Amino acid sequence: VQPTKFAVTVRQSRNWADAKQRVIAAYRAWIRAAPEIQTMYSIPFPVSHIRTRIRQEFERHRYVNKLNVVDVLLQQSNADFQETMNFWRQQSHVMAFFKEEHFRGEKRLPSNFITGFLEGRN
Amino acid sequence: ALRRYPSGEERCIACKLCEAVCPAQAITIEAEERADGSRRTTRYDIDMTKCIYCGFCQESCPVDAIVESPNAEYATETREELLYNKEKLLANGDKWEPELAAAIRADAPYR
Amino acid sequence: PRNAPDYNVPIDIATSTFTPVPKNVQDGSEENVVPAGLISGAPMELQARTVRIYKPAKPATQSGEKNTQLWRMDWDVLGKGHRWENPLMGWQSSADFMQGTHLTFKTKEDAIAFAEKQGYEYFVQEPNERHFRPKAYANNFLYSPGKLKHIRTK
Amino acid sequence: ISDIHITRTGKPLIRIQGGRSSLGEHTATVFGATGQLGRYIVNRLARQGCT
Amino acid sequence: RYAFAKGVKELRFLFCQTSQHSAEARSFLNRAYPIMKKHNPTIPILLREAQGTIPRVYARYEFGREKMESLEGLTDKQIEETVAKLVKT
Amino acid sequence: EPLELTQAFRNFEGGSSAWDQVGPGIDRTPDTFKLPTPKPE
Amino acid sequence: AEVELTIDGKKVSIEAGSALIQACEKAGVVVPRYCYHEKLAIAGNCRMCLVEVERSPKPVASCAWPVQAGMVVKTNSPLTHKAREGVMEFLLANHPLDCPICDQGGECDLQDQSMRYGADRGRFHEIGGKRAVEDKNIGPLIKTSMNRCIHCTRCVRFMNDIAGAPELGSTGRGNDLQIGTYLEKNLDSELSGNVIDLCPVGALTSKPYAFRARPWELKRTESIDVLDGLGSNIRVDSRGLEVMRILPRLNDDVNEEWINDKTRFACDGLKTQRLTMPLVRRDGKFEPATWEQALTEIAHAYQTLAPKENEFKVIAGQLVEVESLVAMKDLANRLGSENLALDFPGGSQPLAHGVDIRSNYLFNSKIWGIEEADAILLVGTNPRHEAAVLNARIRKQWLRSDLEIAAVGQPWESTFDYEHLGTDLAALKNALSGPFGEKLKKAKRPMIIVGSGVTEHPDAKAFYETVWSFVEKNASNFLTEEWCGYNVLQRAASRAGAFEVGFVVPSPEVAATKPKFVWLLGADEFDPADVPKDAFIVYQGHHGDRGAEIADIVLPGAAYTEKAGTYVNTEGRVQMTRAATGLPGAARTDWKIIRAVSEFLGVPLPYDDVAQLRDRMAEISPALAAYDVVEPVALRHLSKVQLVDQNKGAKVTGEPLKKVVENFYFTDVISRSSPTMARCSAAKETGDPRTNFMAPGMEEDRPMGQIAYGA
Amino acid sequence: TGRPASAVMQAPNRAEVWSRSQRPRSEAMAGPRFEQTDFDAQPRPWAAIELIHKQPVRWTHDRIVACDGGGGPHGHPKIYINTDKPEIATCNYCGLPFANEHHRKYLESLPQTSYPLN
Ligand SMILES: NC(=O)C1=CN([C@@H]2O[C@H](COP(=O)(O)OP(=O)(O)OC[C@H]3O[C@@H](n4cnc5c(N)ncnc54)[C@H](OP(=O)(O)O)[C@@H]3O)[C@@H](O)[C@H]2O)C=CC1
Ligand code: SF4
Ligand code: SF4
């Protein structure tokens, strides 16, 4: 806020009820900003595709049961959110977040044993 | 440049002191016994796009084999021309030897 | 599923053709263990690869034991991508970003604790210890009641 | 699709699949690569470590 | 004390050396193995031990089919009957 | 893209001396911060 | 009776009769040394380890001084500082300025202890110059630069006391005293390359290693040797793609700081005859194929032939790990086959010893057991050629005790004196009923050691019955709580691992079936009768050799330096290699080839990761999960059902025991492709002692030199 | 990729490689990168192995001979060479040949020597 546009002072969560509000607050800001993110970096994907990525990022950490670890993830989310909504990231940075735009594909690991073996460890 | 003795034998004996001290890891060396059994290099490369021109190799060499010539006018069209192998470096020493000996002659008392 | 490889793990931007398929990625729900590997920023690959935890043996070429004092953590070399010959210069290229990295620990519980916290697979190699036997100079000159059996030369 | 490609004339190409520094094994000539389409074939080959 | 069915390719007994578990598997093998190896002499009866190993028995059937049975907390007589199921048909 | 080095980094850390080269050093705690010692007898 | 002493003001306790330097090491005190080595006799000649001892006027050699009840030792006094500086000055006065050209540089104890304990500058500026000494030819393996010699005596003491090769010595006197053979001759020990490591200086260096690398550029991987059955602990030094040298690491249980010459010098064979891509033979000539193309032709040729039970045969070679044998046993069983054979004569037949009890085939008294052995009988084994580091362990106990050795089988030139009782099964029975049986009966710690060539003998069933019946008759001597007297010695790294997982042909019925499909799992010493000519041969391995050339499909596998593999040595110790380099070309991990062929054969193995295969190993044998220990055998007495009861009625031919190693240098695929082993074989045959015999260098009749190594 | 003699000869004064791991120039300077190139313009230093063997044997009566390359501080570290074997002794730094006068008749008898002897 005061230092720069989307700056959030680093604070610990008081309890699990406090943490959950921040996590939902963080998700709400992210998926709300998805229309702006598309037109601001000229992303060649629909807001639906972008918003799915937001949920998966939040779902990788759905099973965390440690309060200190949540505070770390919340601070990372605020830092990524600020550097996105401020035009500090470049199209290369945001585009790299979408795993489909790598010339070797998104399925960058072998499907099963025999496809990886026939190609040579993937 | 890579230098010779007055007889024309290579000064380099593959000690690897210049490869170890190099602050930028610009030198790559391979070596075995030569056909006559002499300790000599088979590969002596300097990546001139990694080299920071600090003189540490020239300071570390016990035989005065690797030296920096006074030459600075060798800008190239392609980056590949700045990957010096042993042939390029020994040719440089052959061409620049009278300067190399004169520069060594003047400063060796301080080295 | 009892050491089954999870062929459906999400990839990250450092996932390459040389990355092995992991078994167990941290989720932040493991009991009693800080999930550093979840928040470190390190690629998924480091939870798929195995580190070796060992005391380096004394070199056979020297008597100094300075480098055997500490515990070493090292990454095993993969089948593909560790080294190959660059066609231009003959240099040795690598796709293994861990090839020149090692970690030093005062005790192996420390090394194990760090490895569990990051989520590395690890293998602990215990150090072989010398078997003590007293040595005496005077044993070079023991009286032989019988055939000498060996002729000593100082 | 693999670490081995055998060419029409039989050459075996043991290939290390990767990026810029990898070994694609193919040597290709592309006539008229300075036009609109030549940049997409040259780019695809070179970034696989092909000559 | 009889030869097993034609399906039995091999038997595998895994046990420990200490008294962490019982000594019933060890006593049973002390007795069973000589006569079992006797009546049908061409069946590999592998006795493999290791510190801390829960007692088990494996029976290999045709085409790589196996059945395992835990011998923990089991007296030798029950161990004797546990093997009997794996070998008679 | 995933990192790929044309020449891999060469770590010469293994050339560290097989013998300790510094030693334990010297104690320089002042006397006003070392404990007193019992006198003989 | 550990006495109590003071070193540098801190108290240490150690056994009486121990050297002071041993107490300093126990106390953690670092003492410089050159002549002293823990495995050699004390010399006391270098003068580096002089320390101050209370009530002693002269400074004292801490390697030779005995520990006493109450001595006080000062290792960091001015007197000790002055002694080390002065001794280092004398060591460097005549030492040649050769560190740029010396191969010890960067791993030199003279350089490290000069930096640590000596002065920074020298005071020898004599116009008369330094001593210079002529070089010596002592064979093809050891390059000599004798000016560097500091006269520690380590190479003489090792070669004489340890290796049993009294050809190295020292001639002359004073400053002109010179180490060498007084007359130029090859050093005939398979343990000779240990002097290179023992040498503190670069006076004795490896000829094949000469000038190739600096020590700081080498990745150091601790691993296990697989060219022998002892599993010697080794350090593999590599520079990216290339393995450059093999060094021994300390394991007092198995190899005791030493390795043999083939273990050391066969590493150059790892880069010359290598299988790097699949080959499909066609129109009588091998042709390259993809891995899909090769596995398809296995699947097609399997269907076309439709093998029945035991028409699928697998032969395992000497360098095969347990992962490959377990995955291949799972595959062969799913094809109906129990035809699992080994690479030696009679390997395709059921073995005279069984595999039901681990003690049937293992070295039961452990390698460490030799340190306490009172009497040893060696049946059908030349231990110098089959287990050389274990052979030197027998000499060491023989030198320091009243240990009696006898042998039944082919005589060999031995490093210990032994009583040759005969060469056949008749001689074994006479021995056990003769005077040496009396020696065995009235001895604590008796040992009977049976070679792996007895297992390949036609009378093998009568040998194990003869031996074990003696073990049972004289138990409470051979079969006690602290001791097992019966031992089987494996010269190959894979045999005990194969036995552990039951990788053997169970019955003569399986042995009788003539195979249609034969899988050579790294097999190259197979008999040319266990491989029928009209069978589809598949070779999987790392080296193009005998096995690969007669095959229909060649699959490139991995060598021991390119994989983490599980190996079981002759005593049952489970050990794991560590990969130093990656796979070359299009090669694959050996167990993954078998797992990949199983999908193509329609019987996909359950395991996809090596951790799942390693769980399967514990189900077959749980001791395979315990690395670097030897799990004791609980039911030792049960080694009578298969060694006596099943072996009671066996035909006896009386044929002599044999020599399973015709030539030590050529034993496996790696050593047969080694250019260095070729020089050793050539030099032994022609008696040439010159260093440059088939190597680069000037020679009198070769003034232009030559680039070739190994030719 | 090379027809001219600069593209085949390992050096102007030596056709053949002088170490086993040395890449022959004919294979090294082959491939697409050497297509439209002047080969005489490429760096081709003279082989040092051929030049050092033109050096005549420095005869001496003393058993031990010092060699530092002859530049004083401009050479190599001073080493001492033993000439007692009946052969030409060579400095391990600079390759200079040395021989004792005791061995002159046997060295003159030799059909061919590594060094000219005169
Ligand atoms: N683009 C399209 O929509 C269609 C294209 N095509 C074909 O596709 C191919 C590639 O198309 P595109 O890349 O768009 O074409 P461009 O016109 O963009 O490029 C054509 C290429 O031809 C080279 N070229 C033309 N004339 C000569 C000449 N006389 N000598 C040497 N080189 C010459 C040009 O080199 P330089 O730059 O030096 O002139 C250039 O690299 C061509 O064969 C074209 O005919 C056909 C149907 C549709
Ligand atoms: S240039 Fe000098 S320092 Fe480098 S290897 Fe040659 S002799 Fe040693
Ligand atoms: S001048 Fe260049 S090559 Fe020589 S040490 Fe400095 S960086 Fe390395």
Ligand code: SF4
């Ligand atoms: S032995 Fe040690 S001090 Fe002597 S030249 Fe070799 S590295 Fe230098």
Ligand code: SF4
């Ligand atoms: S040659 Fe080496 S090991 Fe032998 S006495 Fe001299 S310094 Fe010691």
Ligand code: FES
């Ligand atoms: S170590 Fe004691 S004198 Fe050499």
Ligand SMILES: [Zn+2]
């Ligand atoms: Zn010289």
